[PDB]
Amino acid sequence: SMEQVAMELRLTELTRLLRSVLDQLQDKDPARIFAQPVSLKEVPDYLDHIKHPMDFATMRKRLEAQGYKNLHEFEEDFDLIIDNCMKYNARDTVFYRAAVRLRDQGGVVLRQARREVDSIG
């Protein structure tokens, strides 16, 4: 149908906007602490601690399959990156501190994305 096409164009345009949000968020992680899944070879107990692992590469796979229906879904995944790190790692670690800086900086980017998603529909 023409409506399914129109909806597909909306999803494609969301995907374009989310791809730019994801690039901007990831620049706020220049150390690449959150670039890839925590390695189960290197942290073999990780899944005993963290039930829903997340990282930027896994987000990117989901994005390119147009797997985010709305900004809320995407934000949920970004929040998991941060929140998993702040539970697994102690406050006095380079890891925890990197998450805090990513959260604080990313907040700005996400504040305007929310306005852009509402604005452009």
Swiss-Prot record:
Cross-link (Glycyl lysine isopeptide (Lys-Gly) (interchain with G-Cter in SUMO2)): 41
Species of provenance: Homo sapiens (Human)
Highest taxon of the lineage: Eukaryota
Shown residues within the full chain: 555 to 674 of 1058
Subcellular location as annotated: Nucleus; Chromosome
Gene: BRD1
Residues forming coiled coils: none
Tissue: Highly expressed in testis.
TM helices/strands, residue ranges: none
Domain Bromo: 9-113
Organism phylogeny: Eukaryota, Metazoa, Chordata, Craniata, Vertebrata
Role summary: Scaffold subunit of various histone acetyltransferase (HAT) complexes, such as the MOZ/MORF and HBO1 complexes, that acts as a regulator of hematopoiesis. Plays a key role in HBO1 complex by directing KAT7/HBO1 specificity towards histone H3 'Lys-14' acetylation (H3K14ac), thereby promoting erythroid differentiation.
Complex formation: Component of some HBO1 complex composed of KAT7/HBO1, MEAF6, ING4 and BRD1/BRPF2. Component of the MOZ/MORF complex composed at least of ING5, KAT6A, KAT6B, MEAF6 and one of BRPF1, BRD1/BRPF2 and BRPF3. Interacts (via PHD-type zinc finger domain) with unmodified histone H3. Interacts (via PWWP domain) with dimethylated and trimethylated 'Lys-79' on histone H3.
Protein name as catalogued: Bromodomain-containing protein 1
